[PDB]
Amino acid sequence: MEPIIRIRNLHKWFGPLHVLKGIHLEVAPGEKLVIIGPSGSGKSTLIRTINRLEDFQEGEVVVDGLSVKDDRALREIRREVGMVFQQFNLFPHMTVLENVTLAPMRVRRWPREKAEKKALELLERVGILDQARKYPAQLSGGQQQRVAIARALAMEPKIMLFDEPTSALDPEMVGEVLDVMRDLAQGGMTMVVVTHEMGFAREVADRVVFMDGGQIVEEGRPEEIFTRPKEERTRSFLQRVLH
């Protein structure tokens, strides 16, 4: 019922630069929220404050009742929230399996037999079961990002954050990673996705948020936003991006 992510008057300064200018955003449980906008709109900054990767100077960011600014709540937030980025952040000297089993054994205190069985399932689900005994450097970006995805899912979070996970991928690698995201979007997970992929955005989102200049300019259903945009900034942005 209540929003699982509640953001009020979020202001973020990066030097003299006003990155976020009083964001009000509420994400419902299990909602698939997709955030789009031109570069420098602050959308990646916004999604990063949600699991404590950006400090903010004004406003309130609450995740499942936990204040993100509370140092006491950080460990708990890291259990509930998973995140993928442009960079894959894989441990080069750990196997694909070990990269995924690590946190559940270390944090959730799972035995090896239980963590690996879980990890292998997830690796299969994301299509790279045969990569389990390999080291990250032997994998392509498309494979590595899906390892990152499986690693996040292995902690069994209630919320999954996707900060442009295909933006640094070569074009051949994009499709395989988006498919995994589509698979997950049919489920009950609460998902926030920042992306350039508009086909994916209109296809999977329950709700699309258009950001520009550190503000939310327009939001709505994927059909409303892509076909009959209201704000001139929304319309202009889409027209160039949907080329």
UniProtKB/TrEMBL annotation:
Please name one Pfam family that this protein belongs to. Answer: ABC_tran
**A molecular-function term among this protein's GO annotations:** metal ion binding
Tell me the residue numbers annotated for binding ADP.
F14, G40, G42, K43, S44, T45
Keyword list (alphabetical) reads: ATP-binding, Metal-binding, Nucleotide-binding, Transport
At which positions is Mg(2+) bound? S44, D163, E164
Q: Where is the ABC transporter domain?
A: 5-238
> Does Heme show up as a keyword for this record?
no
PANTHER family named among the record's database cross-references? AMINO ACID IMPORT ATP-BINDING PROTEIN, PHOSPHONATES IMPORT ATP-BINDING PROTEIN PHNC
Family (UniProt): Belongs to the ABC transporter superfamily.
Q: What is this protein called?
A: Amino acid ABC transporter, ATP-binding protein
What organism does the UniProt record list as the source? Thermus thermophilus (strain ATCC 27634 / DSM 579 / HB8)
